Subunit: 353 residues, 4 copies
């Protein structure tokens, strides 16, 4: 019985070791955040437009000016290889088959170059800055291997307090690898190569990365650049002012700050203020959640745990199945609300509850 | 202990096979819709008018200009024969004994002509359009057999995602029949009779039926015409503008779109805007639910599952009993709020919570 | 462990037959009303006034111009003799010992005259009109035996639909008696005495008793007259306009109409509009509930089930104990909010939640 | 698994006798107050400021003009010696090691002088007035032994109705001592020394202590003076007008009046009106609760049960551990919301829910 995302979560929980399941499903502190991320979608209900010809519907849409099958993307998640063998490639290939982008994490188990060599879909790279020099190395690496878009994740200045991991003394799987940091030499001694090595021997990232640092990254990267982890129209607007081509409103799936607002709470305001592409994630499970955000102005929605449940439960085929269900879900919803063309979605189809 | 509608649901659940019970009780996806349909009635409470002579009360009222015993109707539901033998006739006869209309579904188990020959009450016909030509055949059939009112159901452009059925692999009972589509020939070959046969071999309806298509239906039908499945004052008004004599605000009992608003949410607005008869269904179980809608301007309320629980539990007598309880319920409520004549109901008896 | 009203309810439930307990605790239909009656008190919280000398507090107050120990009364309840032997007298004597009025029901087990002969406290009489002539007989009977105040209950035009009784086929106890209707002759034949006898052979009251009928009652009774069962500032005001000296906002403890508003919802408005004594009941269990109503302008609060739990659990002593706890409760609350004199209570001590 | 305050409560409940645990955890009457104290923090969520350099954070802050490690204090609680041997000293020493003040209760198990002789941290004294003369004795005693700040608790004019204690017939432990009242002589006879002895033989305090009485206390004490137990901007302002250097908004951890508002409800208003230091307690358990109050203008937050769980569970080390977790918690939160310097907190980081 695999008819929705919840069905896959249930199967994933039966197949994954508890420690791994908790690493995936867990949130920060009391987990009021993940619950809120889900609950907030109930603040909106649909007001369908009847007697509209929906015999011919289209989910196709442009994201950052480029067309894709539907306004979805498989977002950046670390240690996918812990959920399923070659998880990164499984996810990437399922996304490509579906006609949507896949975003590779800086903490992926498969390197930037290898995935680019094994998958010819639209690949994006999510950047975490631990060491400026090292980050610059990954950015150029992604540029030269053909990644089309760069995503800077800014909501991990410090690691989230996820108590499930603390209780399980969660340790990154033994057979796993932080490939992107592989071969970053050593044995060298001097300012850097000593200041760099010590930065790599730390589970914390660059907590000083600021606006000036963003400009730096902006000149380094030539293609589309998005800033991820924003929770205010003000920051979204500032990013556009600094060179960003768009943003990704997100609270990291409730894994960083338990009492953070849901990005859905500032979506409309960010769309109205920035006037630029506003993507979003955190809490999406049903096709209706997705349609509600799109109707509020979101350019696209990134999937986090949703597609990971498919991966952990049934590998690549599992990811394919979740994407198939979600697309049909989105399609079905568009038909029932009377909006045949997804790009025609507006707040007019919603009712504030 | 059969003192209310819930008591009949309980009995129906004990007597029906789980698959059939789930077909009846089930809703779309998470079933937040059916729960909302019930919960929304709690947004209103009564402010009784004391010291009013209610020794002589009247539930009689005009619906579309024609008088009936009370502002209730047994709405259109498919496969009633799966709940109880000759369910369609049981429901029709109970409605007639009570003095209210019965609406026959396009997917009923007893044909349009047979029911008209076995029941002389006020019979209405609910139309689903799968094939324009076939629909025209049923419409004329209903006209010639004496049906007084036609109801166009517009909220099934696509089938609702009801997961209970998916889990039970629900298949329309073997002893059941889609009588109205009986004898629609075959063996014929050409444009239609090939385009028509393929349409009949599909569980999906005409998703292209639009406003122009409604005008078409308007000229075809001479008597009262209602459009069912509306969830906005705007669409209700548009229907009146296109020829409709009234509308039926409904979310199909939460069986089509889980996150749809409850029709109660747009009832007052639809009444104020259209200035025409506004009927409503979805979520009604208690006499108070009914009185609240009537007080907000509804012309009448259609019963869906309420009377079906009586049917599945105790057949025709069961339907009679539910209608008797509801009428006494409505009567009792009118007395306790100080409104002896049902047609005197106004929002003045309500308090927004 | 009898430290509050809930503790007495628990004991009463252990000592009373289920049928009797359900007759007492039960409410109409779904019992959302009784739950609401309790929940509504949470819409207000206290904002204590610190550094106020509360070493000398007073709960004494005038009700309808007459002083009593505290702003409480034991309200009218029928069949008290079913909860405890000579329940009516037990309640009356406990009220008198506490220094507050006791209201006798028209459906009490002890007659108007007998209680007046066995209790010398402030006795009030609650009138139910089944037969005008019979009612007039009881009114004059109460006048001549020394009852100080008459209370007309207007919210029982029809009997409430209490399903607990239906399930238990609740029948008024065999050893009980409707004393006030005793000796109303028979064997007589003519217009009345035949129209009167048939009215007595009916469990329903005079559903036609209206405003004109109230004027009738107003001229018949010389002392203080209150109208009970009101749920709107408009009706409260109309009663004052017709001669009433005050009103009692009430929904009959949620026993008549499940979806009725709580009288607390119109308390402030009734106080502001009528400018006359506004008493109230329904849902009061804690001293804080009482203080909140008093702070909103209520002249006094009538106890229903609260003191009945004491009666059913431990008879007269039980009633004494509940009143003692409530008084100390009220006293304690006044001290903690900084309002030493109960007559100084105002909305300034409250916070709307 | 001791990763947060709740983990310590759980351990404390396993180690303490039920009667003692109930004395600590219990609240007044229905305990809706303690639940509300917790729930109210959910009315605010965070709106982090991204791309801010938080590599260098500071929790240091001035409280009443004096710098301390972080805006926290271990508030006044009675009978700490019942939770752990020499509990008062354990708490005082843990507070000092952490760099924050400890407030000694008038009902502590260790005397004013002894703690001052065994701990050289910033010690504050919380005053309860039972006898003016006796109170004056303690005040001067605290002054001469080096206590820096005096705190007048005004919300115990009468003892709270805590039913857990009533059910357990809670009696102050046999090995415990009300040290501060030790050696207050006897055997003396005359006005006082007879009026004083009778006051000491009473579990109730001076319910007459008013504004004039506060002026009296103001002239008696030369250093910083705070008034604790306020629940309105009006009273907070009045205290400043009477000489107070600041206030402590508090509902005594829901132990005095179950329906009292949470001090969080009047925090912003008190800050805006008084323009003086506004401290607060009641319901704080997570670092986020603390940060929310600080962001609303609170000078500091006093811990009650939070650090008591550490004490009862693991003594002094337990208190150290709770303070360490809370500090890291506060630090982590500041980083995740983009506010490196705690004194830079403003309502701009919050979202009203
Ligand atoms: C197991 C797991 C690992 C994650 N790793 C990363 C990462 O390496 N980079 C990043 O930008 N976000 C990371 N995220 C956050 C996601 O990109 C996304 O914001 C989040 O999962 C969205 O919420 P949802 O899980 O409810 O869909 C992770 C989330 C999960 C559940
Ligand atoms: C078993 C079942 C079958 C239904 N079949 C039809 C149908 O054939 N035509 C139609 O217009 N509505 C159909 N409906 C919807 C009803 O007309 C009505 O909108 C709905 O049941 C109202 O909600 P309620 O069930 O809460 O009363 C069906 C509902 C149920 C429960
Ligand atoms: C067992 C029972 C019998 C009652 N009988 C009467 C009656 O004879 N006359 C009347 O005016 N109200 C009657 N009432 C209503 C009370 O006067 C009062 O409105 C109600 O109990 C107040 O609510 P509470 O029970 O929550 O306090 C009755 C209530 C109960 C619980
Ligand atoms: C066991 C216990 C004893 C207390 N004793 C006192 C006291 O002696 N003096 C005082 O001012 N407050 C006293 N308080 C109240 C605290 O100072 C503080 O207001 C309260 O605990 C804050 O709420 P919290 O427990 O949720 O942190 C006590 C609280 C508890 C839990």
């Amino acid at each position: 019985n695999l008819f929705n995302v919840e069905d896959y979560r249930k199967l994933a929980q039966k197949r994954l070791p508890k420690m791994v399941y908790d690493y995936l499903e867990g949130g920060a502190e009391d987990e009021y955040g993940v619950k809120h991320n889900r609950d907030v979608f109930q603040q909106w209900r649909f007001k369908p437009k009847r007697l509209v010809d929906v015999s011919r519907r289209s989910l196709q849409a442009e994201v950052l000016g480029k067309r894709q099958s539907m306004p979805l993307l498989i977002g950046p998640t670390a240690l996918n290889g812990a959920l399923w063998p070659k998880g990164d490639l499984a996810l990437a290939r399922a996304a490509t088959k579906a006609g949507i982008p896949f975003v590779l994490s800086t903490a992926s188990n498969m390197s930037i170059e290898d995935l680019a060599r094994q998958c010819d879909g639209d690949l994006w790279f999510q950047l975490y800055v631990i060491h400026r020099e090292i980050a610059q190395g990954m950015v150029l690496k992604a540029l030269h291997t053909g990644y089309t878009t760069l995503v800077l994740t800014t909501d991990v200045a410090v690691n989230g307090y996820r108590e499930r991991d603390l209780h399980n003394r969660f340790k990154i799987p033994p057979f796993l690898t932080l490939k992107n940091f592989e071969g970053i030499d050593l044995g060298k001694m001097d300012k850097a190569n000593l200041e760099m090595q010590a930065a790599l021997m730390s589970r914390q990232m660059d907590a000083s990365f600021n606006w000036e640092a963003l400009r730096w990254l902006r000149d380094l990267w030539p293609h589309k650049l998005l800033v991820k982890g924003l929770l205010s129209a003000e920051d979204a607007d500032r990013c556009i002012a600094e060179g960003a081509d768009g943003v990704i409103l997100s609270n990291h799936g409730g894994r960083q700050l338990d009492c953070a607002i849901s990005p859905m709470e500032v979506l409309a305001q960010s769309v109205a203020k920035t006037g630029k592409p506003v993507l979003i994630d955190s809490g999406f499970r049903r096709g209706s959640d997705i349609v509600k955000a799109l109707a509020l102005g979101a350019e696209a929605v990134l999937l986090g745990r949703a597609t990971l449940y498919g991966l952990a439960a049934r590998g690549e085929t599992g990811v394919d199945e979740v994407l198939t269900l979600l697309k049909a879900d989105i399609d079905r919803t568009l038909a029932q609300i009377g909006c045949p063309d997804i790009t025609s979605l507006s707040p007019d189809y919603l009712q504030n509850e």
